Amino acid sequence: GFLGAAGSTMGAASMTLTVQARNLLSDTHWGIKQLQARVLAVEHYLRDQQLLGIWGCSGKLICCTNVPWNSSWSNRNLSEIWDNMTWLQWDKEISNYTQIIYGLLEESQNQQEKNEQDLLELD
Amino acid sequence: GFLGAAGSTMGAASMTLTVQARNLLSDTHWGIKQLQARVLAVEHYLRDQQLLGIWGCSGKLICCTNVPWNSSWSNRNLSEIWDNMTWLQWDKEISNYTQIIYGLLEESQNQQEKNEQDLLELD
Amino acid sequence: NLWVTVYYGVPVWKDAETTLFCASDHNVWATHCCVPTDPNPQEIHLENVTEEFNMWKNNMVEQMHTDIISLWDQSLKPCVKLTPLCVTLQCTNVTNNITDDMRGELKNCSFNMTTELRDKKQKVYSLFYRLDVVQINKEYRLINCNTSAITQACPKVSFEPIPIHYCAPAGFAILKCKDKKFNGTGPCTNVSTVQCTHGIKPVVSTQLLLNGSLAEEEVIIRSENITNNAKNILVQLNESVQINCTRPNNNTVKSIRIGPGQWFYYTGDIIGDIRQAHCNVSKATWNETLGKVVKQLRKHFGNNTIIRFANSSGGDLEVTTHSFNCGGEFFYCNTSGLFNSTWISNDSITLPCRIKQIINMWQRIGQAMYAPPIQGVIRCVSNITGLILTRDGGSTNSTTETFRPGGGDMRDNWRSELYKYKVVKIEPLGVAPTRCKRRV
Amino acid sequence: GFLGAAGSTMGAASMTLTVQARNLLSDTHWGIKQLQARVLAVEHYLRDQQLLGIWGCSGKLICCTNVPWNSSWSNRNLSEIWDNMTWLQWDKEISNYTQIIYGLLEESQNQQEKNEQDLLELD
Amino acid sequence: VQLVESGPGLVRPSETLSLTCAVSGDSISTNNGWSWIRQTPGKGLEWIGYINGRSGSTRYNPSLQSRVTISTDTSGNQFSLKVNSVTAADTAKYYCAFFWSTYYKRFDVWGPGVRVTV
């Protein structure tokens, strides 16, 4: 069920990403408040989809990128992160670097497009 | 034109899918009713797009997947379905299994993503 | 063997309920249906599509009804309230140059009315129809005083119906039935897709339907359950019958101020001998188009039975008479002169009419409106395009059945034009087996 | 920053597509006006995304297609267009052909889909 | 569709092969999968290659590819196979065939074939 994986480790939790995606979409004053809420839910959905587009991850639940992981963002063992932490804990640990990482993902995609425009079929 | 293929066989009808897609996105009380109608049009559009995303068919009008066809859903010649039947008739014939098929499509994509975690080049 | 292939943009649909918007080419209808219409609108014939229609379960009718009620309530919203006029009146009968036909119909009333200054009053004299005034215990009061407040309709706001086109929102489509003999229920084989309906003129009337569309091949009789006496019968004619209505005297409109910025209109004086309002139909034409109806009725009841027509059974004026808006005036005409014949296997018919200004519109209690008087002599000519009839209960008996003008809901007047339209929702996803597999 | 490249040449300006893309999503009477405005921004966004999907472009800021360029739309050099002209000038230069080009882009993708219905490689 | 093979069966070790197949019932220009296959005692069936009658492009068995071409002349509904470096090893029965393979359908049409001795 939805959020049933919240207490699971990151590795195990990642096994069920679709369930968390399918639950994002669904008197004058009352009517306006409800429209407010529905429009906003749509705007948030689209905002995240646009970022996946920008980063080159459109249409995927899991996407590999070309941005190296910085030891200054979080220095932990790969097995530590994936087997001994939940996603909530992880989010707190790196919340300060969220925008830094997003900025780098955007730059990476822009460079990739520049390389594609080359036509010598070489990076 | 729009829905001109409604009486066509499935094979022939499938030749013109774009025309059916491009036609989906076209006093206080009156104003509220109209906003509600616009919002539903958007929410329904996005719901269908999300399913294509989940099933791994994002961006396509025709998408091939790995879920096998069950003889219990419908047992007809492939030629019987594509040449002697329309989409309206077909939709009625298998309306009972719509949810089963959708569930299987999601499971198949989830397995595909798990297989992509392999790094032995999936063989 | 085969695998599932997903297709998006599949041309299928399902029955659905949605909100339609209107469009059209100081009029309320034009103000509201502000959205323009296309010149030369196109439709797409759907070859080899059979669809099922049911005019009695059509929700386009329900929406049209609801939206019309709203227009009236919004249109009267900013108009002068007449609460200050609910006072004791002193009235006498007008006996001056009144013909026998009109004797007792007009009451000449006076009262002490306010002025724009709160400490001053003026004596006001006016004429009223008896149908708007009731005796208190001579002292009279306006008929609406014991039930509700009344609002004066604004004289500069026109409710004259214009063609209105109902249009579907994106994601929906309107299917139109073109079968020539279609009676509103069941399968239809010549269908097409449209974005907007043809223009429908929202004429509001009771027993006879005016200025609607005509049948093309014959008179068509439509009903939900033809043998059920609790259901009405909607008859669509293939020929119009012209009806000429008039209010023959020269009425003079006067006005007073009630409060700051608020004017009230009333009939001051009527010039000429007073004669009754009336409507004429050609007698021969009415008889011919009645015989046509009878022939079609025989198809359902037997060509060895007797078909009789009779007048309304009784009830409120708004039900028992033929009600319509002529020039802005409100007429209630006696149709007993039309529905009086027995059918067994030049001159005009004159229908006397009565006029009233206090109207409880749309079968509601309270929320009354006052119809301002109209200056001069009123004349209009309308087309009778259909009838609402009911069967008088009965049993096998002597196999004579009587059809009476029905009362009917206002919805019935819209159902008679929207009968050929259906609204469906488009559902673009579908699946089918093919020989392809995910490539890798 | 946003529109900083407006006076730049088309070549130079093509490198700032991402910043422009990111700025598209960001009392009864007043409340209705604002909902009106928000809904429309969403509808316009979705229409552009749908067109790109129809043309076979999804999740890309730069997408190549198979429609030949007509000398009747614009008879200019590559160096001329990309190095000595801005996007504003170009947009005006060919505004007459916007719908023609769009119609062709759709036709090209439909043929591509027909070709993909063959299991035979079509070589 | 009906397919009929032709061309000489008597080939010298120093010359080319030229086999022309007639197509009847449809047009070459509207279809794909027009192909050549050969049968010899040492190899039951060996694909040679096919041509796209709509675009004119071809695909060949890599082992034969270096010396073989397929082309059409749609005005007479005919197509042909030509091989340049033809040797004794190329003795075989040659067949004209039509291969239809799409998402919604599968079938073959074969002509009777001809024999070529090198």
Ligand SMILES: *[C@@H]1O[C@H](CO)[C@@H](O[C@@H]2O[C@H](CO)[C@@H](O[C@@H]3O[C@H](CO[C@H]4O[C@H](CO)[C@@H](O)[C@H](O)[C@@H]4O)[C@@H](O)[C@H](O[C@H]4O[C@H](CO)[C@@H](O)[C@H](O)[C@@H]4O)[C@@H]3O)[C@H](O)[C@H]2NC(C)=O)[C@H](O)[C@H]1NC(C)=O
């Ligand atoms: C069934 O259908 C018929 C035909 O459409 C309707 O009949 C029409 O009804 C309207 C409204 O009552 C009439 O409109 C009035 O026309 C007057 C001018 O008449 C002369 O000029 C016309 C030019 O077209 C000639 O056809 C006509 O014979 C005359 O020579 C106007 O003076 C009226 O104006 C009123 O309203 C304005 C509002 O701004 C005020 O300023 C004016 O002072 C005044 O009060 C008005 O416009 C129309 O003429 C009728 N047509 C015909 C052919 O007679 C039926 O009403 C309809 N039936 C039902 C039940 O609705």
Ligand SMILES: *[C@@H]1O[C@H](CO)[C@@H](O[C@@H]2O[C@H](CO)[C@@H](O)[C@H](O)[C@H]2NC(C)=O)[C@H](O)[C@H]1NC(C)=O
């Ligand atoms: C009332 O009926 C008359 C016909 O009896 C209608 O007038 C005709 O309308 C057709 C429309 O296709 C014209 O071709 C004819 O030339 C008209 N006849 C005459 C004598 O003018 C009239 O329009 C109907 N009125 C209403 C309000 O529907």
Ligand SMILES: *[C@@H]1O[C@H](CO)[C@@H](O[C@@H]2O[C@H](CO)[C@@H](O)[C@H](O)[C@H]2NC(C)=O)[C@H](O)[C@H]1NC(C)=O
């Ligand atoms: C309805 O018909 C009556 C006749 O039955 C019309 O009244 C006559 O009108 C003429 C003038 O055209 C007079 O010379 C007659 O004396 C009138 N007859 C009677 C009995 O009064 C009447 O005008 C018609 N009304 C309408 C609306 O057409």
Ligand SMILES: *[C@@H]1O[C@H](CO)[C@@H](O[C@@H]2O[C@H](CO)[C@@H](O)[C@H](O)[C@H]2NC(C)=O)[C@H](O)[C@H]1NC(C)=O
């Ligand atoms: C309703 O009024 C119209 C006129 O507006 C009448 O039509 C005229 O009738 C005379 C004969 O009396 C003819 O000579 C005219 O040519 C007709 N004019 C038009 C425009 O048609 C009509 O007869 C009256 N209808 C009824 C039922 O009384």
Ligand SMILES: *[C@@H]1O[C@H](CO)[C@@H](O)[C@H](O)[C@H]1NC(C)=O
């Ligand atoms: C909670 O922790 C235990 C540790 O042994 C683990 O087995 C269990 O699966 C965890 N719960 C969830 C939802 O992951």
Ligand SMILES: *[C@@H]1O[C@H](CO)[C@@H](O)[C@H](O)[C@H]1NC(C)=O
């Ligand atoms: C990322 O790594 C570099 C060294 O390669 C370091 O200078 C930089 O500060 C790191 N990022 C952050 C947010 O500290």
Ligand SMILES: *[C@@H]1O[C@H](CO)[C@@H](O)[C@H](O)[C@H]1NC(C)=O
């Ligand atoms: C940076 O992260 C730490 C937790 O590791 C947190 O306490 C601190 O407040 C964060 N910095 C800012 C500016 O929020």
Ligand SMILES: *[C@@H]1O[C@H](CO)[C@@H](O)[C@H](O)[C@H]1NC(C)=O
């Ligand atoms: C209706 O059936 C006929 C059968 O000959 C066919 O030719 C025609 O194309 C069909 N209509 C549609 C819309 O497919």
Ligand SMILES: *[C@@H]1O[C@H](CO)[C@@H](O)[C@H](O)[C@H]1NC(C)=O
């Ligand atoms: C689908 O196929 C399985 C066998 O793999 C069968 O048991 C099942 O009944 C079929 N139909 C449905 C609706 O599950």
Ligand SMILES: *[C@@H]1O[C@H](CO)[C@@H](O)[C@H](O)[C@H]1NC(C)=O
């Ligand atoms: C299954 O199909 C039958 C026959 O069409 C239908 O009567 C029944 O209602 C369907 N059940 C469901 C769940 O759709």
Ligand SMILES: *[C@@H]1O[C@H](CO)[C@@H](O)[C@H](O)[C@H]1NC(C)=O
């Ligand atoms: C007015 O008309 C009524 C009708 O019922 C009658 O009873 C009454 O006597 C009349 N009054 C005069 C003054 O004629």
Ligand SMILES: *[C@@H]1O[C@H](CO)[C@@H](O)[C@H](O)[C@H]1NC(C)=O
């Ligand atoms: C109006 O007021 C006067 C007193 O100023 C009174 O005599 C008269 O009867 C009143 N008339 C009406 C119609 O109320």
Ligand SMILES: *[C@@H]1O[C@H](CO)[C@@H](O)[C@H](O)[C@H]1NC(C)=O
């Ligand atoms: C108002 O008065 C009339 C006439 O006496 C009567 O028929 C009606 O029932 C009364 N209305 C109410 C709400 O009492």
Ligand SMILES: *[C@@H]1O[C@H](CO)[C@@H](O)[C@H](O)[C@H]1NC(C)=O
């Ligand atoms: C459908 O329209 C054609 C003319 O295009 C006509 O011949 C045919 O009789 C119509 N079908 C029905 C059921 O009216």
Ligand SMILES: *[C@@H]1O[C@H](CO)[C@@H](O)[C@H](O)[C@H]1NC(C)=O
């Ligand atoms: C007429 O109404 C009957 C029901 O009374 C219905 O069965 C039939 O389909 C309808 N249509 C026609 C053209 O008779």
Ligand SMILES: *[C@@H]1O[C@H](CO)[C@@H](O)[C@H](O)[C@H]1NC(C)=O
């Ligand atoms: C109406 O139908 C009857 C059927 O008997 C026919 O005689 C008459 O000519 C038709 N009228 C029109 C205007 O089509």
